[PDB]
Design a protein around this ligand. Structure first.
Ligand code: HEM
Ligand SMILES: NCc1c[nH]c2ccccc12
Length: 392
């Protein structure tokens, strides 16, 4: 019946031809392996994400507590979701952001100083993976002495959230990582409950729902939520950013001449190489897109990368171009989602990524690409295996 499958080996190598096929010939495409429909068009993805009543977040909550231990932001709605989401945003805004940024500069320069004498650096494996988890740890308030293990346990935890058909051995490891993470963080939450600091964990401890505070296991669940949410996409976007710029020397030069263009470059990178590729939702009642019928309980998976390359939303969608003027040839990209559950860390991510990119451009002179062709891996979250640059 249908022979093009998201789970073909060719898809993870290069999904762009699949994007083009699905939008034209099967915009709501059923995959029997996971009993879910994949949605490829910008307009349908946007409709799904903007109608939380019809397409809810019960899918995410399921295979998540096994590793989260309690309820995460996605499983919340109404005034609870708004209030707790505002609490988390408090940890990356106001005075917390003023204090956090100089620390992230320190993290960045410490990594640069570690590699500068070698005259090359892997933006993925030398910088991205290390900075991403340390930034998240600074945001939360976890001291960096054990960032090595924190990263290890995060990866096993993320693998569970971002995988579809994990075997019994893989499931048990991800669960062990979740327990090790919980063993490390509970004492920390106990300490900060006694002596508060200026970090996200302390914020969660001080939050007040009338006169009831978030229990210690829900603070950990939300802490793990933030650790996972903030770490994974940073590595990939940084690597994609410098790759696309170096693959387009002209645009790389424009960013050097007008450093203000770096924000536009990050946004175009998030559209072009969307690091979060899939957003699942659960259908709450009968519904039809084109002539594909959905039933209550069905699962739809928004294809963020496909939607951001939809020719109905962007002209020349498959070309990297930082000069895209929003003034249909341009639309707001879906890299941070949209609607009720849009990424709480969107503004922070843009600020943090611009900080890092500017510093890399300032300290690394005459950057030259060494990884002339990247190999990308992952279908749920996606990024290059390696992205090496050389410099003076
Ligand atoms: C380039 C970096 C990032 C990208 C591309 C990204 C992407 C996304 C996307 C697409 C969603 C929507 C998920 C859904 O609708 O089910 C989301 C949600 C979320 N993100 Fe991010 N994110 C990034 C960075 C961060 C950071 C730094 C944080 C720090 C806390 C964060 C925390 C969250 C949270 C808590 C949610 C859940 C929002 C809710 O349920 O209301 N993300 N993110
Ligand atoms: N906040 C980014 C984000 C959205 N969905 C995810 C799934 C796994 C890891 C990170 C993410």
């Amino acid at each position: 019946k249908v022979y093009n499958s998201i789970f073909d080996q060719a898809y993870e190598i290069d999904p762009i031809p699949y994007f083009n096929f699905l939008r034209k010939h099967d915009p709501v495409h059923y995959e029997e392996s996971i009993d879910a429909y994949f949605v490829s068009k910008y307009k349908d993805v946007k409709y799904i994400l903007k109608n939380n009543d019809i397409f809810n977040t019960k899918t995410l909550a399921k295979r998540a507590e096994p590793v989260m231990k309690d309820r995460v932001l996605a499983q919340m709605s109404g005034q609870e979701h708004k209030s707790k989401k505002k609490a988390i945003l408090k940890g990356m805004t106001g005075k917390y952001l003023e204090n956090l940024m100089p620390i992230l500069e320190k993290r960045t320069n410490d990594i640069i100083n570690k590699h500068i004498e070698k005259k090359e650096i892997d933006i993925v494996n030398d910088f991205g993976k290390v900075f991403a988890v340390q930034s998240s740890m600074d945001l939360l308030g976890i001291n960096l002495e054990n960032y090595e293990k924190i990263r290890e346990w995060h990866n096993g935890i993320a693998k569970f959230i971002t995988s579809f058909n994990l075997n019994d051995e893989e499931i048990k490891y991800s669960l062990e990582c979740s327990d090790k993470l919980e063993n490390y963080l509970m004492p920390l939450i106990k300490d900060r409950k006694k002596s508060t600091k200026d970090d996200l964990i302390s914020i969660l401890l001080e939050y007040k729902n009338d006169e009831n505070s978030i229990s210690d296991t829900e603070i950990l669940a939300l802490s793990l939520n933030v650790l996972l949410a903030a770490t994974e996409p940073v590595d990939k976007t940084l690597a994609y950013l410098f790759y696309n710029l170096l693959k387009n020397p002209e645009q790389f030069e424009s960013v050097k001449n007008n450093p203000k263009l770096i924000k536009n470059a990050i946004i175009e990178t998030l559209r072009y190489n969307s690091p979060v590729q899939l957003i699942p939702r659960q259908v709450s009642k009968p519904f039809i897109f084109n002539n594909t019928e959905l039933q209550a309980g069905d699962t739809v998976i928004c294809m963020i990368g496909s939607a951001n390359r939809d020719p109905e939303a962007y002209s020349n969608p498959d070309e990297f171009n930082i000069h895209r003027s929003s003034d249909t040839s341009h639309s707001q990209n879906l890299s941070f989602g949209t609607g009720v559950h849009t990424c709480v860390g969107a503004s922070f991510s843009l600020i943090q990524l611009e900080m890092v990119a500017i510093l890399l451009l300032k300290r690394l002179k005459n950057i030259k690409l060494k990884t002339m062709e990247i190999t990308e891996h992952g279908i749920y979250t996606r990024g290059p295996k390696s992205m090496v640059i050389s410099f003076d």
